[PDB]
Design an enzyme around this catalytic site. Structure first.
Site, PDB file in Angstrom:
ATOM      1  N   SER A   1       4.235   2.597   8.359  1.00  0.00           N
ATOM      2  CA  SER A   1       3.765   1.548   7.462  1.00  0.00           C
ATOM      3  C   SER A   1       4.845   1.033   6.516  1.00  0.00           C
ATOM      4  O   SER A   1       5.585   1.811   5.930  1.00  0.00           O
ATOM      5  CB  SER A   1       2.565   2.055   6.657  1.00  0.00           C
ATOM      6  OG  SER A   1       1.834   3.028   7.386  1.00  0.00           O
ATOM      7  N   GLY A   2       4.919  -0.286   6.361  1.00  0.00           N
ATOM      8  CA  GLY A   2       5.908  -0.885   5.484  1.00  0.00           C
ATOM      9  C   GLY A   2       7.122  -1.261   6.303  1.00  0.00           C
ATOM     10  O   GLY A   2       7.923  -2.115   5.907  1.00  0.00           O
TER      11      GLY A   2
ATOM     12  N   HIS B   1       0.819  -1.202   0.000  1.00  0.00           N
ATOM     13  CA  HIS B   1       0.000   0.000   0.000  1.00  0.00           C
ATOM     14  C   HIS B   1       0.856   1.256   0.000  1.00  0.00           C
ATOM     15  O   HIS B   1       0.367   2.352  -0.275  1.00  0.00           O
ATOM     16  CB  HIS B   1      -1.003  -0.019   1.180  1.00  0.00           C
ATOM     17  CG  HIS B   1      -0.493   0.583   2.457  1.00  0.00           C
ATOM     18  ND1 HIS B   1      -0.024  -0.183   3.506  1.00  0.00           N
ATOM     19  CD2 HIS B   1      -0.444   1.868   2.883  1.00  0.00           C
ATOM     20  CE1 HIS B   1       0.291   0.604   4.520  1.00  0.00           C
ATOM     21  NE2 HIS B   1       0.046   1.854   4.169  1.00  0.00           N
TER      22      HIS B   1
ATOM     23  N   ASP C   1      -0.847  -7.318   1.921  1.00  0.00           N
ATOM     24  CA  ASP C   1      -0.119  -6.053   1.975  1.00  0.00           C
ATOM     25  C   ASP C   1       1.386  -6.291   2.100  1.00  0.00           C
ATOM     26  O   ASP C   1       1.988  -6.031   3.142  1.00  0.00           O
ATOM     27  CB  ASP C   1      -0.611  -5.230   3.164  1.00  0.00           C
ATOM     28  CG  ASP C   1      -0.310  -3.756   3.015  1.00  0.00           C
ATOM     29  OD1 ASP C   1       0.232  -3.361   1.961  1.00  0.00           O
ATOM     30  OD2 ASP C   1      -0.614  -2.989   3.949  1.00  0.00           O
TER      31      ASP C   1
HETATM   32  N1  LIG Z   1     -10.828   1.429   4.907  1.00  0.00           N
HETATM   33  C1  LIG Z   1     -10.223   0.554   5.738  1.00  0.00           C
HETATM   34  N2  LIG Z   1     -10.243  -0.749   5.439  1.00  0.00           N
HETATM   35  C2  LIG Z   1      -9.560   1.057   6.963  1.00  0.00           C
HETATM   36  C3  LIG Z   1      -9.440   0.233   8.113  1.00  0.00           C
HETATM   37  C4  LIG Z   1      -8.811   0.726   9.275  1.00  0.00           C
HETATM   38  C5  LIG Z   1      -8.295   2.032   9.314  1.00  0.00           C
HETATM   39  C6  LIG Z   1      -8.399   2.874   8.183  1.00  0.00           C
HETATM   40  C7  LIG Z   1      -7.842   4.284   8.211  1.00  0.00           C
HETATM   41  N3  LIG Z   1      -6.462   4.356   8.742  1.00  0.00           N
HETATM   42  C8  LIG Z   1      -5.379   3.897   7.823  1.00  0.00           C
HETATM   43  C9  LIG Z   1      -3.951   3.958   8.392  1.00  0.00           C
HETATM   44  N4  LIG Z   1      -3.781   5.063   9.376  1.00  0.00           N
HETATM   45  S1  LIG Z   1      -2.242   5.337   9.887  1.00  0.00           S
HETATM   46  O1  LIG Z   1      -1.502   5.594   8.692  1.00  0.00           O
HETATM   47  O2  LIG Z   1      -2.276   6.425  10.849  1.00  0.00           O
HETATM   48  C10 LIG Z   1      -1.658   3.911  10.635  1.00  0.00           C
HETATM   49  C11 LIG Z   1      -1.859   3.697  12.032  1.00  0.00           C
HETATM   50  C12 LIG Z   1      -1.282   2.416  12.394  1.00  0.00           C
HETATM   51  C13 LIG Z   1      -1.284   1.850  13.673  1.00  0.00           C
HETATM   52  C14 LIG Z   1      -0.685   0.575  13.880  1.00  0.00           C
HETATM   53  C15 LIG Z   1      -0.095  -0.093  12.767  1.00  0.00           C
HETATM   54 CL1  LIG Z   1       0.632  -1.642  12.954  1.00  0.00          CL
HETATM   55  C16 LIG Z   1      -0.090   0.483  11.483  1.00  0.00           C
HETATM   56  C17 LIG Z   1      -0.703   1.783  11.268  1.00  0.00           C
HETATM   57  S2  LIG Z   1      -0.822   2.645   9.833  1.00  0.00           S
HETATM   58  C18 LIG Z   1      -4.761   4.862  10.476  1.00  0.00           C
HETATM   59  C19 LIG Z   1      -6.227   4.833  10.025  1.00  0.00           C
HETATM   60  O3  LIG Z   1      -7.113   5.216  10.788  1.00  0.00           O
HETATM   61  C20 LIG Z   1      -9.033   2.380   7.011  1.00  0.00           C
END
Ligand SMILES: N=C(N)c1cccc(CN2CCN(S(=O)(=O)c3cc4ccc(Cl)cc4s3)CC2=O)c1
Ligand SMILES: [Ca+2]
Lengths: 234, 52
Positions: free
Chosen positions: A185-186, A42, A88
């Site tokens: 991420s990644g 992603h 992913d």
């Molecule tokens: N549409 C979906 N399937 C979806 C499902 C869950 C969350 C989100 C939206 N989202 C996407 C990613 N971000 S982030 O980039 O701030 C991340 C937070 C986080 C926290 C823990 C880990 Cl292991 C990885 C990540 S990426 C958080 C967030 O709320 C989208």
């Protein structure tokens, strides 16, 4: 990384940082070998063109161990789905080899059976990155690491408002303010066994960051070991 | 608490059970020591080790 500690000299050597046209880090990666980087599929969507920086611990100075590498080949999983973040995983082949030194070394790829039964049954794993320090916070100029406990599969499935496929697993805290976040991420999720670290996950997603009743979701690397292998030979 | 379940079978890394027995192995960049359990780095900067 929300919470956790700073990676000290030579502590997170397998950390890679995908940088965009403006030299800003936007995703993480794990060094698998002199030519290969492991990251999230992603992430290949967060930038038009990017490069991989290694040996960085402070994106605000030039420690001297940093090295930028161009990507020669991007190998993303044929079955990755943006809708569910399933599959992913992506492997990157660098144009030029990474020269291992201080703060630049690879993480070990484990064997599936041994890893799932001995590594992932361990109390905790380690996640690292230059990602946000808050949900609304700015990214970290310093590389951080966080010890995240492995979370029961069932408990996580219940906690998530989204499907947790067979290619994912969860880690983090239920209420404690510690978790990966955006920008991480990644990045690597590794597990230590007798002073040797093995890659066990790829920071994938989560609902927000360190949110109570939500865990960090990681790509189950043990489910893609044969895929990584044929990829690192092409 | 048998074989690989009893302390990773005394292996440094990978442990497998073949014919009711323990067989140790190592990640790329390590060679199984003469005792068939320990893993010795084959060069500098072997995988999984923090650099010093
Ligand atoms: N549409 C979906 N399937 C979806 C499902 C869950 C969350 C989100 C939206 N989202 C996407 C990613 N971000 S982030 O980039 O701030 C991340 C937070 C986080 C926290 C823990 C880990 Cl292991 C990885 C990540 S990426 C958080 C967030 O709320 C989208
Ligand atoms: Ca630096």
């Amino acid at each position: 990384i929300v919470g956790g500690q700073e990676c000290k000299d030579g502590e997170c050597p397998w950390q890679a940082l995908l940088i965009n046209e403006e030299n800003e880090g936007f995703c993480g990666g794990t060094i698998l070998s002199e030519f290969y980087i492991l990251t999230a599929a992603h992430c290949l969507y967060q930038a038009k063109r990017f490069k991989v920086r290694v040996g960085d611990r402070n994106t605000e100075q030039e420690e001297g161990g940093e090295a930028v590498h161009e990507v020669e080949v991007v190998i993303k999983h044929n079955r990755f789905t943006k809708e569910t973040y399933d599959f992913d995983i992506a492997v990157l082949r660098l144009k030029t080899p990474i020269t291992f030194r201080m703060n630049v070394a690879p993480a070990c790829l484990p064997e599936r059976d041994w890893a799932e039964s001995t590594l992932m049954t361990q109390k905790t794993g380690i996640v690292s990155g230059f990602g946000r320090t808050h949900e609304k916070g700015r990214q970290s100029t310093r590389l951080k690491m966080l010890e995240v406990p492995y979370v029961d599969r069932n408990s996580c499935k219940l906690s998530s408002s989204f499907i947790i496929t067979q290619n994912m697993f969860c880690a983090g805290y239920d209420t404690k303010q510690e978790d990966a976040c955006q920008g991480d991420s990644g990045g690597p999720h590794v597990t230590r066994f007798k002073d040797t670290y093995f890659v066990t996950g790829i920071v994938s997603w989560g609902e927000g960051c360190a949110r109570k009743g939500k865990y960090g979701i990681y790509t189950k690397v043990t489910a893609f070991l044969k895929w990584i292998d044929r990829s690192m030979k092409t | 608490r048998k074989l690989c379940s009893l302390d990773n079978g005394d292996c440094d890394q990978f442990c497998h059970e073949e014919q009711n027995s323990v067989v140790c192995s190592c990640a790329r960049g390590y060679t199984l020591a003469d005792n068939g359990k320990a893993c010795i780095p084959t060069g500098p900067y072997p995988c999984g080790k923090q650099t010093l």
